[PDB]
Amino acid sequence: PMSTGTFVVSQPLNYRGGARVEPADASGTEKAFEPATGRVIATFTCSGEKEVNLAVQNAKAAFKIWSQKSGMERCRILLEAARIIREREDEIATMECINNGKSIFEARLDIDISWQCLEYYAGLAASMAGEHIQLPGGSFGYTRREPLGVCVGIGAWNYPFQIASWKSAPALACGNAMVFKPSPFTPVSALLLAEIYSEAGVPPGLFNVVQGGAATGQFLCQHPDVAKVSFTGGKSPLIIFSDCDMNNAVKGALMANFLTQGQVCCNGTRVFVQKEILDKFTEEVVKQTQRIKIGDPLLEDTRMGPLINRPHLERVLGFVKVAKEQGAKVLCGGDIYVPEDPKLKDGYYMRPCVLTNCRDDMTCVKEEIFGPVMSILSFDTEAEVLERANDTTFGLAAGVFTRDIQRAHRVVAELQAGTCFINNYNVSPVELPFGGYKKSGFGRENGRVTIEYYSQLKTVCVEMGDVESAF
Amino acid sequence: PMSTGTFVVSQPLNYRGGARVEPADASGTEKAFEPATGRVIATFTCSGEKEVNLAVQNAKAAFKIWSQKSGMERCRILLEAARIIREREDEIATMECINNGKSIFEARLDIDISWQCLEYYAGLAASMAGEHIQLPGGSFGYTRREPLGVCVGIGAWNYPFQIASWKSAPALACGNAMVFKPSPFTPVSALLLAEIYSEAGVPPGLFNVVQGGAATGQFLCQHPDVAKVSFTGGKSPLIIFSDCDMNNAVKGALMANFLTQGQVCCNGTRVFVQKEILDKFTEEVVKQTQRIKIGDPLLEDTRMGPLINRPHLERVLGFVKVAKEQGAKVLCGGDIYVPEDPKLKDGYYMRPCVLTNCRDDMTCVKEEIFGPVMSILSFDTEAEVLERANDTTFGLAAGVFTRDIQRAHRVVAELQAGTCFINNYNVSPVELPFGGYKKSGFGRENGRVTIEYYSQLKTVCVEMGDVESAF
Amino acid sequence: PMSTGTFVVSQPLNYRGGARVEPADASGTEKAFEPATGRVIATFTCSGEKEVNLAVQNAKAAFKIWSQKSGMERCRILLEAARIIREREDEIATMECINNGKSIFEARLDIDISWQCLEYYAGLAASMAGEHIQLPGGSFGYTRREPLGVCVGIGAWNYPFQIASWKSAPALACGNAMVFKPSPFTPVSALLLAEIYSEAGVPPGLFNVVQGGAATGQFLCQHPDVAKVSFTGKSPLIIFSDCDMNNAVKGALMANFLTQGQVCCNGTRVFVQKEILDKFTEEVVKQTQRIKIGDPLLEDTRMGPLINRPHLERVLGFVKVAKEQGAKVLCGGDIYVPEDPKLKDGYYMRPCVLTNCRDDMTCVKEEIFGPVMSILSFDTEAEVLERANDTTFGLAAGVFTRDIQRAHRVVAELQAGTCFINNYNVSPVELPFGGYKKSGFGRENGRVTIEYYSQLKTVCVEMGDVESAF
Amino acid sequence: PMSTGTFVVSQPLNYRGGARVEPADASGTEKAFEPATGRVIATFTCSGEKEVNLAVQNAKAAFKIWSQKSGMERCRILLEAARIIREREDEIATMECINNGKSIFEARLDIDISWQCLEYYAGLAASMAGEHIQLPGGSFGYTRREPLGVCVGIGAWNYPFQIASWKSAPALACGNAMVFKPSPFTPVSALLLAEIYSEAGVPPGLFNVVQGGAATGQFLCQHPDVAKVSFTGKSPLIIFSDCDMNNAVKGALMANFLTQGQVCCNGTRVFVQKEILDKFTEEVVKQTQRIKIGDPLLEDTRMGPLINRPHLERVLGFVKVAKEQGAKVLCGGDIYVPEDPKLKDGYYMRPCVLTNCRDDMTCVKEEIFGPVMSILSFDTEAEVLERANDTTFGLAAGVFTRDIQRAHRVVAELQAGTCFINNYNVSPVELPFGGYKKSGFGRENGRVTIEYYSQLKTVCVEMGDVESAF
Ligand code: NA
Ligand code: NA
Ligand code: NA
Ligand code: NA
Ligand code: NA
Ligand code: NA
Ligand code: NA
Ligand code: NA
């Protein structure tokens, strides 16, 4: 029943002891917006030192209770929380859309990964085991993974609910308590998560939320009772050879640039296209790009909502202005989009941008824009691309499009990108294993590695026989 | 054939490109000693920036070759190096003793763990596997662990050859190159390892050694081509209840305090002893402590060699002086030990020390001495000890002596110590799993976790079908 | 709302294509009972060859659909079935009690393990991964675990619902279809499971149920389209004189009289050290005489009836032979007549405690499958380990002592696959860590049972050229 | 220094208590040959019941010592045996060649896998760990893998030293003892392994060797002290017209003519797409006719003789029946007489390539176990899949096409457990990732073979008090 241009936060945005609270202390005052309308949905207080201390002391007490619960008990509560998220999916997706501006289409996908994450770690909480080892004469050594205590999770504005689920689910599955600090741009959706954990049966204090910016974050990092803080060259390339399947390359290109309004570092923004198919690819992309439905994020047919805020939209438009000054040819977009609905008129919209005649020395090719901007760079040979494209960090992604798999695997072996795609490109958070595919699963390793980030190995040795003295 | 009071370094102490070299640049000049005699075994140059750059550039080139070798090929060379260490064990142990001062007894034990470590990781190099996952429509995702590049290992003086093996074996098993910086106190034994890797068949540059202190270490940390650097409340308690087996507790106590001349952080120095058995335990400990054979570390019967250096010896003798000022009762030792052999006259020896009438406010109970000093503190009940002993950090060890296992497991559950011992106490480096027991093995987790420290997960997705466009 | 002495099966007991069906052919006719009343709850037909063929052909078709579903999709449906079991727990526990006779207390515990099992394997279905390996020149090898096809589950009467969930959850999590054959003694509770899987969203045919005995079982084993069939001295308890008396007595009673002592794993041979023999024997008889025998649907009942009249007759026969052989019956070992007249024809007997037992006595040698405790006196640690170690690996053992060196020494010496120190849990063989409550399954158990219901498929991709030896 | 036409066994062929022995009992008398010459290298006695009993009793005693050794100690001994195999590689490869007939080229490859296998399991022996689990109130459960006891290895003639290593290395790494029964065709090379284990430091009895056939094998299976016995449409190759010709031809020859095509693994049914039939058939015949047939000890030999005269006669019989049934012999299928007169009575034949092959022909239906390639023409992807999906899981398949969508589609459709894309490796079933050179074993293969040679022991420690239901 919740629609665009109506929502106003009517409750406090901090969460401690199983209840929404006003911060005890201030480190600022921020405004959260509905990017679709440009309306202020909340004027909230940034948490000070005393408030951060209260949230950590509260989490410490909940940790002491929760860490004493068995794996199977923590699993039951996390599986209930996953069922509550699934039942309230649309309500959560709606609230995510209002504050962030992504399409209800993409918000539902984030909520799915959110409850999937919770079930995965709940499963791991229930099945965890340490090692048992035999020592001579009946003596034995055994290991167990223990939680750390109070963990802090830092939020980002591009995947608010998802980052919050993805940080808290493993931390909590381990036996830890979490103090979460959302991005001051997106304070709202993390409270839905806090409320849902409480409903599922987590002890009061286990998942706390303190709102704030840099000063709040610093108070959390510096807090002596905080065990751990979980934070959030060239840019991600997309290579399109002339032997590729045109339609799939065009579809991949648009998916790699214009999903989440292109406000992701995952995005395959540098689109290296082979000289022979340049013209055909460029024309088909512009054609498919001009068809992208820009509008109200709550509408089922919207595939492009607004940019997070007004300063962010101005920055993206600034990059387009500098691009054409530097010699780029704007094919479509890169300008303010005006919707027909007068309730969306002060909303932060723009037309998706496709740039041709791009060079490696251009700032639009060098810098990550965080907007719907595609840079098309022409290339001649496999050797040339790999030279221009291998200045990419491991933390980034890459995609290759070719029908010949020998070429594909050769290019994937050469590129320094941690996540590679062959004849596809998925835009998904870094933390997601197997490039964030739908019917993929998490595998086993990802959870093992993230479980050990939120825990410590305790070792016990039992001497059965007598002590062998060196003296 | 190598004996005490004769060895002098006659070759350069840096190692690059499969050969011993003089540093190209200086950041100081250090003296390495034979602690048994107080003789200077080497006057060496500390590596400067240009020298660190040469060693890293050389490691970079070796990395490029080695990382391209298969797991099975890296395994063959690491198993051959383990065979060479095992064949040259006594020569290595002797050279370790001359520079460090530990007994040939303890040096052999370190060399054993060293070649055991190399076999373990060689086995893991050969059997490594990533994950394969099925995606809908014949599509698939897969992972692989790749090396980082040039890894740096920082050495310590207490386990010179052991720390160099333990850091390099996993790093190299992964496909990395290592630049190793030994402690300026112990430069010599790491060159034996460098030489052995070369003999085994590692490419020139794969295991480099640069000598130096803090400035050398800083140059290594700051080097832009260095992928990763591997570094190194109350103190480790030992609880002795009155229901324990006396002889085993006394043996454990002496092992926990006087092995490696008590120059280890993991040593169980705070010895909480229950009021009823205090007198009998104290007397038996002093009796067994006064029997400890102090002398030339090359002698098979020596169980106590000299302290690393004269400044270190002076510091320990200073702690004993402050302890008796604060109210401690010295039972035995804590003074200069003079050997009968005139070649050991200027060596850094002291008698193992046993202190009674100790309190929790005394600096000898609060501070880590790094010498053979045992603090005996009387206690009344299980509740009292656990209060006085739970100011211990996770990174530390603990030991409990009692015949009742319910008490033992209760105390082990309550203590914050990462490594716990029941009716025993092993003094072993932190990195060692299952408290560094002899016929223990490393299990599976330890290697998995250490591999993951020296590598990164590369993910590849292959789209078999068509791209599903949201637009 | 379901109570004792009222239930009658009013629907067919076979299940195929998402519906209860009458078998297409016969291999017999069995009677299922309510052991608390002795009433016939069902007269059912044992499945013949044609019926077994129909159930397998149906499972084959469902397998083809289900095996094509992703891990995550199979997980969703198995987690829903676990939620349905949990919501209907009391209804399932009640129906289990009526047909089997165990206490509502113990039935709830079995149902808990049943939905816990489903969640575990659902989790593993979602997170399964094969291995990826690099070969020279960009070439690579990879593995995947594939289902087998039509798997058969064979049921037992002592844990009807538990066995059905325990065999079907992993088989189904793998991508297989199952044809389940319950024990002809307990046909009823497996249909609740069949119905629940259907409700959860399994395709019709994925979990079929054919009723029958040995002939039905043989038809299933011999069926050419069946990929795999998953089938269904004695366990000692050593009580040293340095043990904690109350804990040993509690452990003894738990190890003998739970599930009416009808489990094979039960610690029936109770070796007790000579010094505490008398005190231990007296305290045990005292606690045993206090065991609440009655209607299993009652919350305070800890002992219901024995499964059958021929089964009850057999246990009573062992007691008769025991006292003939020289045993001294302290309490029980005779027909129990409850207060409630609706329980008058129920298969009830008082729990038995036997003293003055010897190793040559048939009650100490043979497995009774009733509430019978044999107390054997012993002198030393060396003696027990001689008399007691003639136990096979598939059995359990328990040791009671305050000294852990003795405990671990005894546990190291005994050939028993599952050992207990200062406790004794009575739980199915298949349950890891001796079937403890807040234990979990660990990781290995599931990996091993996943392996039983699947096969490793290997694929090698050559990137470069073929290296010819010729 | 060892050459063809000279070797004679001069010692007994049984091995017990760290020494070569004559069997105490007889179940037959077999002759072992040098297939390259037709010479008798040994006339040996097949072990009877009493001899099998002695070897098992001896293994039982060694088991008791070895099982008590730590993982690290068993690892040391197995790493020393791998080093001894590696140092004596050529001597072992030579002795393997003399008795079996494979090329020194292929024998070295088998010896490599043999010492690689030993190192792998030695590594696993050193790093083994069970599970540790927390239970409420400080209580805990733990697991450990224990050896079984006396394990029996059954040998095959096609990979003598390899099978002996592959069965013994894991069995021994677990803490077991092994009684090994080689194929009566190849008794010799397993004694080199027995002798090498002894030299490495295994206790006398740990690796015993009893020679014999079926009656010996039956005595081993029936022996009450034996814990476990480890025993030993056809594999298609699909060549589409969009494949790389040279790689397909190379793959075809590798898949048919390695190990004289005497493996069950071999991709003998060669389905070739109608457009490339003629070009492929002619290129195959060309490369087949240039395969170097001769003395297996020569470095350039790629084809030796067949294991024995009866096997050679069987293969020649298949060729005779093939041309009767309508096949067109392009090359081979007949007695080969080498240039060397010492190879005169050797079991040689020229490698065979058959065209005009139909599905109803016995050469396409039956496994030949000789160098015989059947070329069957096909029209479409749908046709091959129907004609080729009659292949069991235990078999292999290979597909040659430049389009990977087709390749993965065909690999998904085929029931073969091991599939190859644009390659075909001929390697023993037990080998993971299709037996590639710089592959490694991965982790799962060893975990699964460890489980086969061991049993899980579970121990529960109650820290608190016993929770009584009564
Ligand atoms: Na609100
Ligand atoms: Na609310
Ligand atoms: Na961000
Ligand atoms: Na020197
Ligand atoms: Na080792
Ligand atoms: Na050092
Ligand atoms: Na030298
Ligand atoms: Na070097």
Residue numbers in the entry:
A (entry chain C), B (entry chain D): 0 to 231, 256 to 494
C (entry chain B), D (entry chain A): 0 to 231, 257 to 494
Can I see the authors' text?
In the present study, using kinetic assays and affinity measurements, we showed that among various available aminoaldehydes, ALDH9A1 preferentially oxidizes TMABAL with the highest rates at very low saturating micromolar concentrations.
Co-crystallization with 50 mM NAD+ with or without 10 mM TMABA product resulted into different crystal forms. However, the three solved structures from P21212, P21, and C2 space groups at 2.5, 2.9, and 2.3 Å, respectively, reveal an ALDH9A1 apoform in the absence of a bound NAD+ or TMABA. Therefore, a switch corresponding to a rearrangement up to 30 Å must occur for substrate binding followed by NAD+ binding.
